[PDB]
Design a protein around this ligand. Structure first.
Ligand SMILES: OC[C@H]1CN(CCCc2ccccc2)C[C@@H](O)[C@@H]1O
Ligand SMILES: OC[C@H]1CN(CCCc2ccccc2)C[C@@H](O)[C@@H]1O
Lengths: 803, 803
């Protein structure tokens, strides 16, 4: 029903276009076609329905000439496109019927599509949700990035160890993209700066070509189709031009767009400048086709997703000053009013600081511009806070020391009219700590825009069962207006609704339990509580704290085997960065625990530990609707927002978490009685750091914790390699930056409360209903409406374009 | 008229499919579309008409299960595909009308298509003509090769010097190919040989993937559409699997299909094995889908185009012996009956001899097989010619010496049931000289198959004006039965026909003269005799002899300025191999002569020297119909056949040439009175070599020749670099392998006879008519019918498949 109408004319028309594409496009007959061929024929049929809208949307923007939004990101974690396109075009039921009549299962065909895995995690998925919301809200918005030939690696688990393999996502082709080789642009590297009578000139550069590929981004049932433009690196035709080697060395230039970096390398800097330089030429071209750059900020907004595209600031200055001949002060005025910066973390290991010698060689003109920006900026600090010499060194874009570095975050703050964090607590921490000096100089710049997720992909698409039972009571309006879910509060005592919510969850769990047996040959009890933590493997996300709880349960079972315990399936998934040794050790630990627990006859089906292999958007869409418990247990102050948390909330899971990131706002919206909050607050973490964190203290005073550490050390979980986990124990005991032991007791206690509530199915489900009903604020439609009004200066619209 | 019907239903249907493709396929509206977009929309519309026939042709072969022909070549010089497809499908007039009604010029759109330049010259063009003829003759034939990312380089002339640039022919895409990533095959390199109880095993190999791309090859109006399958190199997904570098090093494997070699490097050997290994797996798969390999030669013919795919012989043995477990003698019987080899030249510099140490490392199992082939072969020689020890060393596949080499030609003769040359004189030279020993052992193996050209591309397509005036008198049957052109003999005294032939030539010359002004800003007299030599720049093709004639004419004009001479436009074109210094010097000489001649006021428009830049198939289609005189002046015994010669003959040019290659058969067919033959015969060249060639003798006895040499030496043609041409003069005087001076006198004399005949337009044209009328034998339909009956053991057919 939420999947639209299956009209007689539409079903007939889809069937014939399907057959046309199979014959003419794929060059196949029905007798030689594989499931893959059928997928492609379907993909091309659905794609056809986009193009008319795509052309008229871009035609519409040319006529109306609205302010254009440029969202610059090095990551767009798109996942699969087929189902999303059907949903947004109201084609899902029609295609389902059309394929059924051809003797095909549409769900089977959907599984053939590769994830577009052009992101690592939350940052890349946020960009993807944002594109969806911008189209749904009728904004003239463009996503700009890089078309990586290889996305995030596929994770294979071999002997409990992560193995990486190339994600060759383009092998069979991408039906969604359109190459635009006609709009290829030159990008310059290296060379030197020459000063003449008429200003500076950047000369003797190497040229790399930037070739755009456009992907359509459909809005939800409004006939708006926006563009995601991704640049591909091409060598010029006179490149290096014995002969054979010159042709083979073209690879060097084209390596720029070859691979997405996981997580100061020259290739990464090249990628960062490549996307920025090509994108800005496009922006200016489009602006000139509307001399007078005073109107530039009225027609252009550039959003810098993290500091990765921060070179947009000195690149824009370069173009305005060196090429368009504007004076410095006017160019700077235009730059600041055009650009805005989103910070994504306070963790020092993630902050970009480029060695000066790199910029010197690669982008000599940009370094000069950065120096000049810094000088003028520091003069302003000096005048506002006279004599405060330490403030000057703290605020400088140039970090002095062993190697000189440029702080890209400081560059972004200076060159932007708005700086935002991604959840209220994160945004406050920014103003109180790392950007305190900048906030004191320019308080007006600093904002919050709490993250969100798209309810199209993260409810309608992945959980149609839940979307439907909601639509039955309150209609379909909530899909583009998620605040309407509040209406579900008046159904909290409705015995029919309670039964339906719980039924949808059980079906999801049954479906996922089947998926596990079929594609991974693993057997789980679908009646157990589905306890899931899925996200990148990092020490701050504290997968290890989860591991300690799992082992505690196992040790409690072995101690009192004939005592009753609420059965659990504990699922942990996520990728470790290839060079991150500790993260790789944690994965090994998780599998090692499973090896012991899953094969202990005394445990039975009361406890299972499963490591979810190759976590990615398409896997998320399967496991999230099946979850009962969402683990969001980062040390308070470390997780800027989180977005997985919101996905679980929308899909009927209860949350055990710390007061970190968006968890704080989630608990505020639902009421803290409907959340399982535990552990230190930010203030408690601060107190512990001042006093000094001593892990040994917890080890000495908690016998259950001591036993686990002794088990890890002695080789209980690694019988043939007794010291395998020495690194983990050492880290926990002596250099734990994230205070795992400090939250252990309260975590285990809170987990007991979870189990207690699960014993009462009716009251569990009523609490679930109170969560789903208050999850409205965490729609990316809300987030994007806030960016539009408070940063970009444009009004969202829900009005249809003509079909 | 020869361009088919323009029906009301067809024109209407083409127009709507054109618009569909522009909208849905290209994602453009009429207001943003460029000529390139229109070309692509047309290309896709025409392509649609192929697929139905393509699918049913391959379906037809599956049912009827005929003997399959595999033509293995490292070069396929296809040129443009659009017009050729229209011609063979009878769509040319219909598309012309359909585009006219859309407000488009179809000829303009045709110029946008890039040449598929996957060949160097005659060898690659021969393969292309052959594919056309095989489809036209209804043979179940497949062309197999490599999809080079970069074809033959684009030639730029800068300051009279050749510059090479990458031929990025795939930049805008190739509408004609269909990627078949589903039929990807593994190819092995390196590793080592292991001997077990159950035979040899090739282990520890590196794997490169071979991905096929299929291109349709339509027959002439018979609804047959055959396949050209070209392999692309892909790295496996666990390749080298810090992380980033492993992904970037995938380039190394994929370099195999990156670039076509011009003209013993490891990359070239890899290309040669790559095409062979992937192709043979395909051949065997298709054969198994018809255990019993006795029937293999009844169902499979493999034609080795030159020695480049010669590894097919030991690869086939490897598969049959190591994998299928056949005994050596039976496998060898199957191999010999399956394979046939075409030799393309007797020139030693072109013969492939691979260092043993290369094969040792790259293909260790193949080396073992080659040694075993040699041993068994030499035992057979020893038994046939007992005690003849020098014969044994001469015939060995293994050449001993400083470095040990494998002679790939000797390998091909031993492993093939048929060996052919490419013109009668060439085939005789093979038996008399380089393969004399092999001919004495197995006389039955040795054949001739004189080359041919396709009358579709080389008459109908490039010279519609001539095709039409011929069709007016004798009908359209000759297009697929070129012997019918003999009927034109009865029109040699027909005043109407004479006028028409001459009119078509003048129009072609006017059209080409306009092309030169527009695309190259050069001005020529269209009334002058168009004297043209187009082909690869090589010393044996004797472009230098042409240069000496040009200078002689210039010196004769300057001597008697007010004397009347027949005006000439001398056009020379062709590419020099990048590392071939002498060839590059000859190009410079040609331009240097033009610089002097074209700007001498005394000369006027009586003599022009033009160097035709970037010679290629599409340029050939323009200049050949415009030519009056075809220069085919290789030293007798060096040009195996030539095919350009035949193109010129078919298109109304008279030929000045030596008795070399197919020139001998061309003069035989037309009668020698209708050809301008001059110079030494093969026997005369032999006599001169025995005596010793002394260039000085000619210099001393011919004052006109002396003057030219003195002009070159003194710096007449290079005023600012007086010694620029020292290398050329030195070579001519002291180490001329091709005896340029020896043919000078007779050449200049013969050129005078040409000029005399040109003064009498009526008698020139009557001789032209006698040439065109006897050009029938040089159709590749004839050549291929001979291969089919005499080598492959199959019957050609002109019967239509159902439409
Ligand atoms: O804003 C999107 C997400 C962005 N991420 C950025 C994580 C950055 C990071 C990267 C490597 C190591 C530590 C941290 C944090 C989440 O809390 C947010 O929800
Ligand atoms: O058979 C096709 C052509 C094949 N070519 C092969 C030329 C090979 C060669 C390549 C480099 C240097 C010298 C010779 C010779 C022509 O006479 C033939 O017509």
């Amino acid at each position: 029903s939420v999947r639209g109408l299956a009209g007689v004319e539409n079903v007939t028309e889809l069937k014939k276009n399907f057959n046309r594409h199979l014959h003419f496009t794929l060059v196949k007959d029905r007798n030689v076609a594989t499931p893959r061929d059928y997928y492609f024929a379907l993909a091309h049929t659905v794609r056809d329905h986009l193009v008319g809208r795509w052309i008229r949307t871009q035609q519409h923007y040319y006529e109306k000439d609205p302010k254009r939004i440029y969202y610059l990101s090095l990551e767009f974690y798109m996942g699969r496109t087929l189902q999303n396109t059907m949903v947004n075009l109201a084609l899902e039921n029609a295609c389902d019927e059309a394929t059924y009549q051809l003797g095909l299962d549409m769900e089977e065909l959907e599984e053939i599509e590769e994830d577009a895995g052009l992101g690592n995690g939350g940052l890349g998925r946020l960009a993807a949700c944002f594109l969806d919301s911008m189209a749904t809200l009728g904004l003239a918005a463009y996503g700009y990035g890089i078309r990586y030939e290889f996305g995030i690696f596929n994770q294979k688990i071999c002997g409990g160890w992560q193995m990486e393999e190339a994600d060759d996502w383009l092998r069979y082709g991408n039906p969604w993209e359109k190459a635009r080789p006609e709009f290829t642009l030159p990008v310059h590297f290296y060379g030197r700066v020459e000063h003449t009578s008429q200003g500076a000139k950047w000369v003797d550069t190497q040229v790399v070509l930037a070739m755009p590929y456009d992907t359509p981004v459909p809005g939800y049932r409004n006939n708006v189709v926006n563009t995601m433009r991704l640049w591909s690196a091409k060598a010029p035709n006179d490149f290096n031009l014995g002969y054979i080697q010159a042709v083979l060395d073209r690879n060097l230039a084209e390596n720029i767009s070859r691979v997405l970096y996981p997580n100061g390398k020259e290739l990464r800097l090249k990628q960062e400048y490549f996307v920025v330089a090509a994108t800005l030429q496009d922006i200016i071209r489009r602006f000139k086709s509307s001399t007078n750059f005073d109107a530039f900020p009225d027609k252009v907004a550039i959003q810098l997703n993290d500091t990765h595209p921060s070179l947009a600031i000195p690149e824009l200055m370069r173009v305005l000053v060196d090429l368009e001949r504007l004076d410095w002060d006017k160019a700077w005025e235009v730059t600041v009013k055009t650009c805005a910066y989103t910070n994504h973390t306070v963790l020092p290991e993630a902050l970009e600081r480029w060695p000066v010698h790199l910029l010197e060689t690669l982008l000599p003109r940009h370094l000069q511009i950065i120096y000049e920006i810094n000088q003028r900026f520091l003069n302003r600090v000096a005048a506002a806070f006279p004599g405060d010499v330490d403030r000057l060194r703290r605020m400088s874009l140039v970090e002095e020391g062993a190697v000189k570095r440029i702080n890209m975050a400081h560059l972004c703050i200076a060159g932007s009219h708005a700086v935002n964090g991604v959840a209220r607590i994160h945004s406050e921490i920014l103003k109180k700590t790392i950007f305190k000096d900048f906030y004191e100089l320019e308080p007006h710049k600093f904002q919050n825009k709490t993250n969100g997720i798209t309810p199209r992909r993260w409810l309608v698409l992945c959980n149609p069962g839940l979307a439907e039972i909601i639509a039955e009571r309150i209609g379909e309006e909530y899909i583009s207006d998620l605040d309407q879910l509040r209406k579900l509060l008046s159904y909290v005592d409705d015995e029919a609704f309670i039964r339906d919510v719980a039924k949808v969850k059980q079906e999801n769990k049954l479906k996922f339990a089947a998926y596990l047996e079929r594609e991974y040959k693993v057997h789980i009890n679908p009646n157990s509580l589905f306890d899931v933590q899925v996200k990148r493997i990092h020490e701050y996300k504290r997968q290890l704290l989860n591991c300690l709880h799992v082992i505690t349960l196992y040790n409690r079972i072995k101690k009192e085997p004939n005592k009753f315990v609420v059965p659990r399936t504990v699922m942990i998934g996520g990728k470790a960065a290839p060079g991150y040794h500790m993260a790789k050790m944690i994965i090994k630990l998780i599998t090692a625990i499973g090896d012991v627990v899953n094969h202990d006859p005394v445990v039975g089906d009361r406890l299972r530990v499963i490591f979810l292999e190759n976590y990615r958007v398409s896997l998320a869409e399967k496991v999230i609707p099946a979850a009962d418990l969402s683990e969001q247990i980062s040390t308070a102050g470390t997780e800027a927002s989180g977005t997985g948390n919101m996905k679980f909330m929308l899909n009927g899971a209860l949350t055990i978490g710390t007061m970190d990131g968006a968890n704080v706002e989630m608990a505020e919206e639902a009421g803290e009685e409907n959340f399982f909050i535990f552990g230190m607050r930010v203030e408690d973490v601060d107190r512990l750091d001042q006093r000094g964190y001593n892990a040994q203290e917890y080890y000495d005073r908690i016998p259950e914790l001591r036993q686990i550490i002794e088990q890890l050390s002695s080789g209980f979980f690694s019988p043939k390699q007794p010291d395998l986990f020495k690194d983990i124990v050492n880290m926990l005991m002596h250099h734990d930056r994230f205070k795992v032991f400090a939250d252990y007791e309260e975590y285990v206690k809170c987990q007991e409360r979870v189990s207690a509530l699960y014993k009462n199915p009716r009251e569990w489900t009523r609490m679930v209903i109170r969560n789903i009903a208050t999850s409205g604020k965490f729609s990316s439609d809300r987030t994007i409406a806030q960016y539009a009004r408070e940063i970009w200066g444009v009004e969202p619209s829900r009005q249809r374009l003509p079909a």
